[PDB]
């Protein structure tokens with residue numbers, strides 16, 4: 430069933446690395462800062478039942494079921510794994526408000542939240558924008574529950590991520606916002622339903638296709654901060670850039686940031702090009718300082734990986750539309 434409704438969520442941009450919006454859980458609503466993640470399908474927030482020995486729980490908003498008149502108990506144990514850390518807790522049900530839409534949703538109350546990395550988290554929880562296939566406990570994802578209401582003009586959702594005092598970004602549920610893109614969308618069909626993953630035809634450093642020559646996978650992840658490849662791919666890429674590997678990143682000398690070549694991603698029919706301005710955190714131009722890149726090595730395990738991931742580095746240049754009706758991803762140049 431389709432309606433006429435489009436709904437939007439204003440996002441906050443934290444240092445070009447974290448983009449999050451707000452949701453309300455319960456009656457009266459308890460508000461949480463959440464990441465809208467196409468790379469996962471579970472909704473979770475920290476719990477009032479999290480032990481204060483977890484320092485992260487001291488530093489974030491906690492859902493208290495005892496203050497909500499609409500809460501429905503479940504209790505099923507749940508463990509959720511991410512790139513940087515793992516959370517564990519139990520399932521609960523309550524009303525969730527996302528941009529004006531009110532939906533009865535099953536979500537996990539997190540009772541184990543490690544200080545590393547959750548102390549670095551500016552957001553409280555996560556809202557999974559993926560398919561039921563990737564959902565732990567085979568729990569209906571929020572978008573599937575929103576589609577079921579028959580209010581949305583279309584079964585699509587769009588992402589706009591700004592460059593670091595105005596709008597941090599925007600999510601549109603049931604459409605796209607033309608104020609944030611230029612030209613026309615170019616679509617790429619998903620390899621298979623269940624994942625927001627597409628086929629990538631090659632990666633060039635300069636003009637020459639130095640990587641992904643025999644084809645590779647690309648996960649379009651709104652919950653990822655960077656553009657990521659396997660340890661091997663990123664080693665070749667960085668060697669070509671003249672970047673040196675540290676513990677958590679690669680760096681160049683700040684003076685050599687503007688001289689770095691363009692990086693292109695062959696997706697569907699087109700070439701998606703990023704200049705050094707799009708992938709270097711250009712904090713200065715000093716010969717005496719090191720500058721980080723917005724491209725990181727990430728070994729994404731099977732069945733999803735080995736795969737590349739196109740996170741916020743890519744979405745900042747290319748406004749992204751996720752089409753649930755036709756199992757495809759659309760890109761247009763972001764305004």
Ligand SMILES: COCCCCC1(CNC(=O)[C@@H]2CNC[C@H](NS(=O)(=O)c3ccc(C)cc3)C2)c2ccccc2Oc2ccccc21
Nearest residue numbers: 446447448468469511512513546550651652653654729741
């Ligand atoms: C663009 O804004 C996103 C900002 C949030 C990113 C970010 C980091 N990004 C992430 O975790 C990614 C979010 N999207 C799903 C992805 N899963 S995966 O399939 O690629 C994968 C799964 C397991 C392993 C071992 C490796 C890869 C991991 C985050 C996102 C969602 C959930 C938790 C989370 O933790 C933290 C904790 C601290 C700091 C950043 C994060």
Ligand SMILES: *[C@@H]1O[C@H](CO)[C@@H](O)[C@H](O)[C@H]1NC(C)=O
Nearest residue numbers: 502503504505520535567568
């Ligand atoms: C928890 O939710 C699932 C559906 O996700 C349901 O089938 C199950 O019976 C629930 N468990 C309890 C104890 O309510």
